[PDB]
Design a protein around this ligand. Structure first.
Ligand SMILES: OC[C@H]1O[C@@H](O[C@H]2[C@H](O)[C@@H](O)[C@H](O)O[C@@H]2CO)[C@H](O)[C@@H](O)[C@@H]1O
Length: 321
């Protein structure tokens, strides 16, 4: 089943400056009882960021025992708690700051990573899908479509069933999607289970930093307006979609109204969303929906209303008929 409502659970990718880094100091996996809270809230799909450099300290070599085992543990806990997990290689189309497709990081090395990820986890019941790369951007954009095919090829050697979530150029911007996405039309998935995943924030620069409030001229449909270019492209090209990140601060009711409008539009078009973000070690982060003393998380109540609505049969938008 494809859940329309889901959340990111971030932390395993934190403190990119420290490699390998230390669990519990630089990065954080869900502790005991973590998924039970979210399951009880009625959330059954999670997107989980992972750091490539921690999974694979050397290219074209075996996955790191300790970090990969933490992923094993997380998947086990998700399964215990009725949660389905999208593994996200949260790397901006780069390995140790070098773009996939450059001499340092050949596409074959990225294919190798994806082979190893699918080989290790394809047998895990909690695994739902693979988001093969978070937010290609900048000098990675031009080479990304070639890298994406290599990633698809890698997963499909070992997992011929699960959805592949394919992000786009320019931080997978939903708003700018059609400017660049035609380059993705050459991608092929022999299993026919490929889904494009765009990101949308509704601050002025769409970075999610929220440097300003809604403003005097706030438009409630801002979220919808920013995903329309993506969804319309999907319809035009007969493709399937997904929103892998969207988040808002908890300090202005207007953001919630925009979120509501967005959720309605995505629901209508059978496009699932992963809210950014929950996680075990966010502290005061403005977009966090993790429970924290003294903080209300109105975004959660809203997600819960939607979570009750029927899911679609598959990733939308529905084919024309
Ligand atoms: O969208 C999340 C992503 O935003 C990045 O900032 C971009 C922004 O997306 C884009 O619309 C604007 O034109 O450019 C900025 C960069 O200057 C941000 O850098 C990422 O960390 C973030 O994940």
């Amino acid at each position: 089943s494809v859940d329309l409502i889901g959340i990111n659970v971030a932390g395993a990718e934190f403190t990119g400056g420290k490699l390998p880094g230390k669990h519990g100091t630089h990065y954080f996996f869900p502790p005991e009882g973590y998924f039970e809270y979210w399951s009880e809230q009625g959330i059954h799909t999670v997107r989980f960021p992972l750091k490539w450099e921690r999974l694979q300290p050397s290219l074209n070599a075996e996955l790191d025992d300790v970090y990969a085992s933490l992923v094993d543990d997380m998947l086990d806990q998700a399964k215990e708690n009725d949660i389905k997990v999208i593994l996200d290689v949260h790397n901006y189309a780069r390995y140790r700051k070098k773009v996939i497709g450059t001499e340092d990081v050949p596409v074959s090395a990225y294919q190798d990573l994806m082979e190893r990820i699918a080989k290790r986890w394809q047998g895990h019941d909690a695994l739902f899908a693979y988001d093969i790369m978070n937010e290609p951007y900048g000098s990675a954009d031009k080479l990304w479509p070639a890298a994406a095919q290599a990633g698809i090829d890698g997963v499909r050697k070992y997992d011929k069933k699960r959805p592949l979530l394919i992000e786009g150029a320019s931080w997978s911007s939903a708003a700018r999607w059609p400017r660049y996405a035609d380059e993705l039309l050459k991608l092929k998935d022999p299993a026919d289970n490929m889904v494009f995943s765009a990101h949308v924030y509704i601050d002025e620069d769409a970075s999610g930093s929220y440097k300003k409030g809604p403003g005097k001229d706030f438009e409630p449909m801002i979220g919808v307006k920013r995903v329309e270019p993506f969804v319309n492209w999907l319809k035009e090209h007969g493709k399937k979609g997904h929103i892998g990140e969207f988040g808002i601060p908890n300090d202005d009711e207007r953001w919630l109204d925009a979120m509501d409008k967005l959720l309605a539009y995505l629901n209508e078009n059978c496009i699932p969303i992963n809210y950014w973000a929950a996680g075990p070690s966010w502290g005061n982060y403005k977009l966090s929906i993790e429970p924290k003393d003294g903080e209300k998380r109105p975004q959660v109540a809203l997600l819960k209303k939607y979570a009750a609505k029927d899911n679609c049969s598959d990733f939308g938008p529905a084919k024309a008929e």
